[PDB]
Scaffold this active site. Structure first.
Site, PDB file in Angstrom:
ATOM      1  CG  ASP A 107      29.489  43.850  39.197  1.00 37.39           C
ATOM      2  OD1 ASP A 107      30.663  43.781  38.798  1.00 37.39           O
ATOM      3  OD2 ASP A 107      28.602  43.037  38.928  1.00 37.39           O
ATOM      4  CG  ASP A 143      29.088  41.234  33.176  1.00 36.64           C
ATOM      5  OD1 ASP A 143      28.356  41.450  32.195  1.00 36.64           O
ATOM      6  OD2 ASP A 143      30.338  41.268  33.128  1.00 36.64           O
ATOM      7  CG  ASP A 176      26.537  39.846  40.227  1.00 36.01           C
ATOM      8  OD1 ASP A 176      27.473  40.633  40.003  1.00 36.01           O
ATOM      9  OD2 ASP A 176      26.300  38.865  39.498  1.00 36.01           O
TER      10      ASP A 176
HETATM   11  O1  LIG Z   1      33.799  36.392  35.113  1.00 38.35           O
HETATM   12  C1  LIG Z   1      32.648  36.459  34.641  1.00 38.35           C
HETATM   13  O2  LIG Z   1      31.732  35.734  35.070  1.00 38.35           O
HETATM   14  C2  LIG Z   1      32.245  37.686  33.871  1.00 38.35           C
HETATM   15  C3  LIG Z   1      31.350  38.565  34.732  1.00 38.35           C
HETATM   16  O3  LIG Z   1      32.108  38.985  35.869  1.00 38.35           O
HETATM   17  O4  LIG Z   1      33.385  38.443  33.455  1.00 38.35           O
HETATM   18  C4  LIG Z   1      34.074  37.825  32.373  1.00 38.35           C
HETATM   19  O5  LIG Z   1      33.126  37.391  31.393  1.00 38.35           O
HETATM   20  C5  LIG Z   1      32.441  38.437  30.705  1.00 38.35           C
HETATM   21  C6  LIG Z   1      31.607  37.802  29.601  1.00 38.35           C
HETATM   22  O6  LIG Z   1      30.687  36.921  30.231  1.00 38.35           O
HETATM   23  C7  LIG Z   1      33.400  39.438  30.084  1.00 38.35           C
HETATM   24  O7  LIG Z   1      32.602  40.509  29.535  1.00 38.35           O
HETATM   25  C8  LIG Z   1      34.390  39.980  31.111  1.00 38.35           C
HETATM   26  O8  LIG Z   1      35.373  40.744  30.422  1.00 38.35           O
HETATM   27  C9  LIG Z   1      35.089  38.805  31.790  1.00 38.35           C
HETATM   28  O9  LIG Z   1      35.915  38.123  30.833  1.00 38.35           O
HETATM   29 MG   LIG Z   2      28.855  41.046  38.313  1.00 42.83          MG
END
Ligand SMILES: O=C(O)[C@@H](CO)O[C@H]1O[C@H](CO)[C@@H](O)[C@H](O)[C@@H]1O
Ligand SMILES: [Mg+2]
Ligand SMILES: O=C(O)[C@@H](CO)O[C@H]1O[C@H](CO)[C@@H](O)[C@H](O)[C@@H]1O
Ligand SMILES: [Mg+2]
Lengths: 254, 250
Positions: free
Chosen positions: A6, A8, A202
């Site tokens: 993953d 983020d 995560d």
């Molecule tokens: O759902 C979330 O918490 C984050 C991390 O998974 O993804 C969204 O948020 C991110 C930005 O924080 C974007 O980069 C992704 O495309 C998505 O829109």
């Molecule tokens: Mg993540």
């Protein structure tokens, strides 16, 4: 061994950058271990990180392959080949209007918001927010906590699936990280190499990833899901730890 | 006599046009009685209805006059002179960003949304939604019922004012329908004509309007505020009733 990871909160630091994970990624590359991003992020966001295919975008909605992948799959899409696993964004958005009518509450997603608004809500730059808005499969929802219970039920009632990516809920149909990882492993040029899969993540959207791999590692906050390994620290420091403690030993053996 | 009228729910109907109000309006015209729209809608929305100035937009945030109004006021803008009573939209929006900080949560409004989204949330066409997004003073907020109280407290803490328009909350500073009515009456060329003002509104958010006129008529549903006349039926049917019963006899 293939490492499915993953982005983020796992491979990326809190600013969305790869710096802190470089050392661990270089260890893996040196050992000839492929690393496959499996993310809620869009193709445009992954490209902006400089990551090359194969990779899996939008929670498993799309599997991207190099144009010259030895196994012929998917359809050519802009210098890649794409295997679409999930409904297209347009169909999800149409079905969301029906969920909203059932919920009797607004259900706003990125598709409803300006780049400026998405930037404000996410902490992303305006340019990065445009990339996050370029969605092909999955919608990111912006829900007030008070409405979540009602909204999720409305999504189920209209045949959509939901998940959560760390900060936001997402809606889609047929987008599952494990389904995508399974497909990619089945499309791997070297069956032996694909025989042993590692998955790191995560958040809730990674649970299907953990079920689709042979060795699962959680680098999020708090306690791990059952049967998944933990690390002493979250994020890239967790990824680094996992490489050094869990993978490197397995890569020599005998 | 001047007739100040709210638009939606009063002069306009479910789909947003003139029911049995056309005839009621032509009658007032024939008598040379001015009718002044007083609305939450933007100037672009009012123009789309074909309404000529003077009119009051954005909950009293702006008063639009014909460029050649006999009393010099406001700032020239094409065929209009505009008297700005409220903070400009950009400033409201900047204060909203502060309010979000205190509330510890997103406060979204039309400025954050696409025209397509505004259209879906309001039932307007995309074209009408674009006009509703062309705001100069007041922001329309999109809030879930359960977040409303936390948000309102934050708005006030940063020096903004709020109102309820019938379906949406609005945030502004200095936009008040009564203030705008009082200002227009003071700017009226013939003081005798503005001496007696009538105010018709379909909602309770027309209270500031009701207070600023000499005869207040509620053409909404249920009991009217204290000190305000009522009609048996709402809308242009109420407007027509009100015009026939209360005005024409004068
Ligand atoms: O759902 C979330 O918490 C984050 C991390 O998974 O993804 C969204 O948020 C991110 C930005 O924080 C974007 O980069 C992704 O495309 C998505 O829109
Ligand atoms: Mg993540
Ligand atoms: O708040 C509301 O309920 C209505 C009527 O007060 O005004 C808003 O909503 C209307 C659409 O229903 C827009 O035409 C206006 O510009 C404004 O955004
Ligand atoms: Mg109204």
């Amino acid at each position: 061994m293939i490492v499915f990871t993953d982005l983020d909160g796992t491979l990326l630091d809190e600013r969305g950058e790869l710096g802190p994970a470089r050392e661990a990624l270089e260890r893996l590359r040196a050992l000839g271990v492929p690393v496959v991003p499996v993310t809620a992020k869009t193709r445009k966001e992954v490209e902006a990180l400089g990551l090359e295919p194969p990779f899996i975008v939008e929670n498993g909605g799309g599997l991207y392959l190099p144009r010259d992948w030895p196994v012929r799959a998917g359809r050519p899409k802009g210098g890649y080949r794409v295997v679409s696993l999930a409904w297209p964004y347009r169909k999800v958005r149409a079905r969301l209007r029906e969920a909203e009518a059932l919920a009797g509450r607004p259900i706003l997603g990125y598709g409803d918001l300006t780049a400026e608004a998405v930037a404000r809500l996410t902490g992303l730059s305006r340019e990065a927010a445009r990339r996050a808005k370029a969605r092909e499969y999955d919608e990111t929802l912006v829900l007030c906590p008070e409405e979540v219970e009602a909204v999720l039920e409305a999504l189920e009632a209209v045949g959509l699936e939901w998940t959560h990516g760390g900060r936001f809920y997402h809606a889609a149909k047929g987008a599952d990280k494990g389904r995508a990882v399974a497909r990619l492993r089945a499309l791997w040029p070297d069956p032996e190499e694909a025989r042993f899969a590692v998955g790191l993540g995560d958040s809730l959207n990674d649970l299907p990833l953990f079920r689709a791999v042979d060795l699962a590692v959680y680098v999020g906050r708090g306690d791990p899901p059952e049967g998944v390994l933990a690390t002493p620290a979250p994020g890239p420091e967790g990824f680094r730890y996992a490489v050094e403690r869990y993978l490197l030993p397995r890569l020599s053996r005998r």
